[PDB]
Each structure stands twice: as structure tokens, then as C-alpha cells.
Amino acid sequence: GEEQKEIETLVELFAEAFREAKRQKKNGTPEEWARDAVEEAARQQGRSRKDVVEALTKYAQEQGRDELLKRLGITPEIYKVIQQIRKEEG
Amino acid sequence: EQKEIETLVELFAEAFREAKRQKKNGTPEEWARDAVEEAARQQGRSRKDVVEALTKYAQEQGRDELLKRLGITPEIYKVIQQIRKEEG
Secondary structure, eight states: OHHHHHHHHHHHHHHHHHHHHHHHOTTSOHHHHHHHHHHHHHHHHTOOHHHHHHHHHHHHHHHOHHHHHHHHTOOOHHHHHHHHHHHHOX | OHHHHHHHHHHHHHHHHHHHHHTTTSOHHHHHHHHHHHHHHHTTOOHHHHHHHHHHHHHHHOHHHHHHHHTOOOHHHHHHHHHHHHHO
16 A cells, blocks of 8 residues: 555665665674664655654564565575585585 | 474574573574584484575575574664664
8 A cells, every 4th residue: 555655665765775875884884874774764755764764664574574684685694604504514 | 395394493493592591692603503513413414404404494484484483683673673762
């Protein structure tokens, strides 16, 4: 519905800004990038920062946590270690 | 095939929780490596079979399902929820 569309737009703007913040500030932290991205997506759509994390939370619950993570380009550390062991063994 | 992978994931998951209890100040990498060797020892199998079964389970069932069993929340989602707490 229209609510799904509003969520998708905020999620996409946040994921675009997060990937861009990671690119521009490579030595930053995931928290730094997420905070920049929330600020950025909020000013684009003309929404609050609360509205941004609201949508990200709704997206995670309705689509899955891994779905949001795929759009951010994030592999959880535990899988990074599983792939490293996989490479070590193989 | 399905039963073989779900049982390996079970062993790895409880070995991970166990390692996290025995090494509470350890890192996630130390726990995962302990659990891979643990599950391999329990079933008399190789380390490569364990992480392959993990990767296959994660691909068919999703990434966050294995993490739910580990009791691990990705760092980025702890960040999001921290911001949501602040905006509240």
C-alpha cells in the first residue's frame, strides 16, 4: 500500500546515503555512517530522523533483517568469520 | 540432507552459546572458531563440513536465522535501535 511505498523510499534513501557515507569516510564507523545516513535521508524526503529509523525498523520486521543488510552492503561479522574459516579450510 | 544440516547448525549454535558463556569477554571470532571445532569434534567430521553446512543453511533459510540461534545482533542494527531510542 501507500505505507509500504513510503517505507521503501525512506529505506532506499537511507541505504544510498549509508553506502555513500561509507565511501566518503572509509575510516569512519558503522555508527558514524548510520547517523549521517539518517540525517541525510531525513532531509531529502523532508521527514524527521525518527521517521527514518521508524521505516528501517518496520522494513526489518516485515522483510527481514538480512534484507535490510543486503541493501546496506553489510555482511555481519560472524559470517565474515565463517567465510574466513571457509577460506582457511579450503 | 535437510536433517544433516539442521543438526550441524544446532551443534554449532549451542557450542557458540557455550563458548560465549565460557569466554564472556572474548570476541565473536573466538566463539565462532571454538564452535566450528567443537561441532566438528562432536560429529567426527572436518571443519570444512561445518562451515559449508553453515553457509548452505544461511543461503536456504536466510542470514538472520542463524544469528537468532547465536543470540547475535548485527552491529548496524544495534546502532539503528540506539538512534530510535534517542529519537524517542
